[PDB]
Amino acid sequence: SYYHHHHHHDYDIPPPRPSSGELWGIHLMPPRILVECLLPNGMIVTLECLREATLITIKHELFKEARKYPLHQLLQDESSYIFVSVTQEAEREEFFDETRRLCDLRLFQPFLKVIEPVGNREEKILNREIGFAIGMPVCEFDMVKDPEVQDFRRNILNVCKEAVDLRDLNSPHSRAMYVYPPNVESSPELPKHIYNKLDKGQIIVVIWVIVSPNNDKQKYTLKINHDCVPEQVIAEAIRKKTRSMLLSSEQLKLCVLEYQGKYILKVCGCDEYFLEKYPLSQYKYIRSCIMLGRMPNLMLMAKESLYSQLPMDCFTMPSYSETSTKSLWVINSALRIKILCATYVNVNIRDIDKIYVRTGIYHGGEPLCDNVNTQRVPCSNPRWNEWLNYDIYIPDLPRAARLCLSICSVKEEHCPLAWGNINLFDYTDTLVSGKMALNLWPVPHGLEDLLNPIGVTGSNPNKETPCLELEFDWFSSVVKFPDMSVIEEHANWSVSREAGFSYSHAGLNELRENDKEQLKAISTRDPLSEITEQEKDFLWSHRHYCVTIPEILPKLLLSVKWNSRDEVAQMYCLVKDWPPIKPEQAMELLDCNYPDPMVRGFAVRCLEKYLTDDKLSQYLIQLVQVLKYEQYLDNLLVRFLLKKALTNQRIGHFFFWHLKSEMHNKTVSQRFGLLLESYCRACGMYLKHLNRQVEAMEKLINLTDILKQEKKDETQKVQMKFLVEQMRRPDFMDALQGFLSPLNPAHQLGNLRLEECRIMSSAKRPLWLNWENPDIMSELLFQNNEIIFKNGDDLRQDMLTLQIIRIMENIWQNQGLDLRMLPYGCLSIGDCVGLIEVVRNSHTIMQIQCKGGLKGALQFNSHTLHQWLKDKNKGEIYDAAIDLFTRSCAGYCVATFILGIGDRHNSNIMVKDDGQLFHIDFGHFLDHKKKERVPFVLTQDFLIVISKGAQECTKTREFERFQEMCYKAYLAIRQHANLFINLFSMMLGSGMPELQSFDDIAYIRKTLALDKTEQEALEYFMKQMNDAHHGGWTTKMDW
Amino acid sequence: QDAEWYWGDISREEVNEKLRDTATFLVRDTKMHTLTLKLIKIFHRFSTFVVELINHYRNESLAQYNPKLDYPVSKYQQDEDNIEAVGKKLHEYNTQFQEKSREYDRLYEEYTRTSQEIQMKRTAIEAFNETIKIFEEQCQTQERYSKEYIEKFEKEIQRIMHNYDKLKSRISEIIDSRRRLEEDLKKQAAEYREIDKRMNSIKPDLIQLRKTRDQYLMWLTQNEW
């Protein structure tokens, strides 16, 4: 009847991560298990011990059962020896902490061996902390026999030494500074809208003290100028406290100094301090307190007590500590590469007729014609021993030159089967020669291309993969790149050489035309604007003029022909002393497009000279990812990042988490581990703090795993029964009660409150946790710390958008435009596992609708939101709440549209009690849907609120106000668009399916319509917004 | 003047996207402020010719203008008078990529799951091997201190020998475990190859359908499917 009565016979009824389990196979080891503990004697006494048992208690009772067994006399006094066994990472691990529980060892199998302690340096031996924290044994690194790796570890400690000395140089002030960096804004001058909130530079601040019953606390409320520093603020509080009828002004003044220097200001209820003289407004807490219309609560903190909390770092060095035969420009031959033989390639014989290897020389983008070796030996056992010849004189190879290749199978059956890339120079500036064995990577999901030159350079460390064997021409000597001294000569000679020609050709007369300032026009252009060869020569020819426009430096590298060694040599020289540029400008230079070290190095110096620790935190995600494209392990960017990491604990905290999150990624696994090794060795007592966080995350990761795959198809009631039962168990109390939330390590987490902990409704079983705040001023800030641990979704796409959102707010704020957007906290801590900050007193539009739902069977009254919102805010409040709501709504409209994030519906849009609106679960972010569109469409419901419950709300003063904000805000972002493109561009490494290529990033361009006039763009922006909304968006412009 | 390979006001990005998977000539053109091969701006007022220019370098080397300048590829694909029908046909062609993609991407996950599963097993063995080796050391460890006290053949030795044996019969059990793993990893490795096999088979089918489909879609003049 329905389906033309035609059956389908096919039809019938019928993410990954290394186990976080206590045992191999098993997620949760049983309460009682059978532990075969092996003794020096050769007796296998088998033991039953509690799953949560100390090694102490096992050794203590093993010895008891030991007497009752053969050869009791041979076994010595307990204290003499110790426990060791094979772990879930296949490594033998000696067990120095006897307090460690059995389930916390990640044993492969449930057995222990007793041996005496070997290596007198037990404390040295006990850097398993590093490996624990890092996620792989430091032992594994010593095995690595590559000279680059070995050199990295030995050489990189220069930084570590330097860093340590600065911390303890001015000990202890200096230590505390490192441990508790001041959290301050980029510039002191406050925005006028912020300025208006306070009265003629006046702020009311409450300072608290505890004094002599050391149990009771005392406010000293007071009104200070915002620019006042803490020293002055501490004084004001001391003046107020000690004023008395018996105290004369002279007497009082003298006490103030003696008690003045002795105290420091700390924020109440979280470990954030003010130890640097900046204007109070400049600290973040302060400026939050202003905006949120809240009164600051600082606390006078005895320096003596604060210094007592800091512990001695006691950094210790680790156990680990020619004749330049022919220069490159000497060599006189065309580049030759000998392809030998693929091995493991697997293709159905029938389907693909023939298979061949395709190679190209690259410098990011190509320096000569790609060539493919003749298609041959298709079916199997490919052994084409062809030498490929590339038209480029060997001297003309640029330092950062890389061979790119793949294997393809095939009338247009073109398709890559495998790919790989090789740096043409070793880390020692040496041109590579000889046989090379290269294990290819598998193609990514996204690319039909045959080459993948963005692919990380180096051999895939998966052995069981297609391996391609190669020969690199040998020139009777190891060939090294020329010294900087040598290149300069060539630069100068080629300069002197230019004067003598008479005629003019396509690319270079001396006279510098005023009309041709096109450069400036081009300069301003956004990076994704393709530049023409005609423009390329144009620029190249007036290279010397550009030194006046420092900002044009990046357009001016893409112009250069990198194949010509003359041009490049000259370019090295411009770049040498070129003028420092704005860090955001400089950041473009660390992306995949600019691989030259000289260029890179210059870029870092921009950062070194001009990058404020505040701004570095803002851009820290991007800067770690750009590490993938850096050519060797030892580079200046890493050293810049490592010093900043070791010189600022807050920067270091996030430095560690961002590296650690990517360790699952096998392309960067090696560079990031070694970088983590470095950092962990020298960071200080934080490592113990990081180890607690890592212990906790692993505990949660394993727990969630059990709900997601063993407790699925169970009632929530049964799951929560399990959840609560498991958390009460002692290793969980230990492992989660006392540690710093990774979302923000200022917030201290203690004594988990299980009352308030629960599994959320989502099928991924995100855990909703609530812990006690143990700051003595819990009350003045927040009493309970809540955060959502989610194992299943891939946060970093969300992660990035929240960074972009945060970044728009700053631009707008600093352009006087007060659009308030809540970029809520998010941290990716591994493979599709993360934390999400919880915002209280915030509900989804849907929830609003369900709360305010009448008898039924109708559309929920659009007014419900307004009605709900009216009922929370009554009185003079109501005007302000709409403002906030209205401001936020307009702000999100622009960003959402600009970024083209996921379609918004009632389910992914949140409104706070106060009136602020925020977005969550952005998901996919640049129209990956297609496989120009308004994601956020204001429905009736929003408009009513925007127009204060009007009828026919589209034509209201309120809405007019609203449209203004969008144009100004959208326009504001458009003017800064350069920054967003680089931010996106820098993330191309990170294995994110949205960012596979520059093409992907290109949607933003369309969205901001960088190809039209600003006035044109406003009309275009209005067009789409009118087009999507169905009306109200028309006929307006500038004064 | 249309010239068949002239796209009028096609966007910067889309040229790259129509020059997607090309081994080629195509033309584009701020009006106040352009052939792509390498983007070269043209000038009607770049370096004695507009339409004739394309024919001028259609069969002639551009080396004259610049050294780096030593396939029309804009076929409208006439290769069907009913807009809906050709549309239905292209949508039915489309109805395959939407399916083909799904099979491609289904395997891509299994590809990855299997590959992760493989390393897990791969490392597991290492785990055994080192465990295995310790139990050997243990059984060897006792003989030095076992026979060394053997002086009696009173009672004690007989009991200890039975306790010692478990060890040799445990080692037996473990080797059997690793073994049992190894035979699964083979079953995995072989599984793994097959996925790559079938991926390289869909891999380029998926390409041709997507192309003619886009060609059929591009062919008409006014995203239903």
Residue numbers in the entry:
A (entry chain A): -26 to -13, 2 to 308, 321 to 409, 416 to 513, 521 to 943, 950 to 1057
B (entry chain B): 329 to 351, 354 to 359, 362 to 365, 369 to 372, 379 to 386, 392 to 393, 397 to 398, 401 to 421, ...
Question: Can you list sentences taken from the study reporting this PDB entry?
Answer:
The two recently opened beamlines for macromolecular crystallography at NSLS-II have launched the microcrystallography field into new territory, with flux densities up to two orders of magnitude brighter than those previously available. In this study, we highlight the capabilities of the AMX and FMX beamlines at NSLS-II by describing structure determination from single crystal vector data collection and two methods for multicrystal data collection. The advent of next generation synchrotron beamlines has necessitated the development of new strategies to fully benefit from the increased beam intensity and smaller beam sizes while minimizing radiation damage. The high dose rates, in conjunction with the newly developed ultrafast raster scanning goniometer brings formerly time-consuming serial crystallography measurements into the minutes range. These new opportunities mean that inhomogeneous large crystals can now deliver high quality data collected from their best volume, and crystals as small as 5 to 10 µm can deliver one or more complete datasets.
The PI3K signaling pathway—which regulates cell growth, metabolism, and cell cycle progression—has been the focus of intense interest due to its frequent dysregulation in cancer, diabetes and autoimmune disorders. PI3Kα, one of the four classic Class I isoforms, is activated by growth factor binding to receptor tyrosine kinases, like the insulin receptor, producing the phospholipid, phosphatidylinositol-3,4,5-trisphosphate (PIP3). We have previously published a series of PI3Kα structures, including the holoenzyme, the complex with a lipid substrate analog, and soaked crystal complexes from a fragment-based drug design effort. These structures were determined from crystals grown to an average length of >100 µm, which required an average of 6–8 rounds of macroseeding. Due to advances in synchrotron technology (discussed in more detail below) this present structure could be determined from a crystal of 60 µm, thus reducing the rounds of macroseeding required to obtain diffraction quality crystals. Initial phosphatidylinositol 3-kinase α (PI3Kα) crystals were approximately 5 × 5 × 5 µm, and were grown to an approximate size of 30 × 60 × 15 µm through 5 rounds of macroseeding. A 60 µm vector was defined along the length of the crystal and data collected in 0.2° slices, over a total rotation of 140°, at a flux of 2 × 1012 photons/s, total exposure time 28 s, with a volume distributed dose of 10 MGy (calculated using RADDOSE-3D). The data were processed with XDS, data were cut-off at 〈I/σ(I)〉 of 1.5 with an overall Rmerge of 10.4%, Rpim of 4.6% and CC1/2 of 99.8%, and values in the highest resolution shell of 93.5%, 41.8%, and 68.5%, respectively. Completeness was 96.4% to 3.35 Å resolution. For example, for the PI3Kα crystal, vector collection along a 60 µm vector uses the full volume of the crystal to allow for the collection of better data.
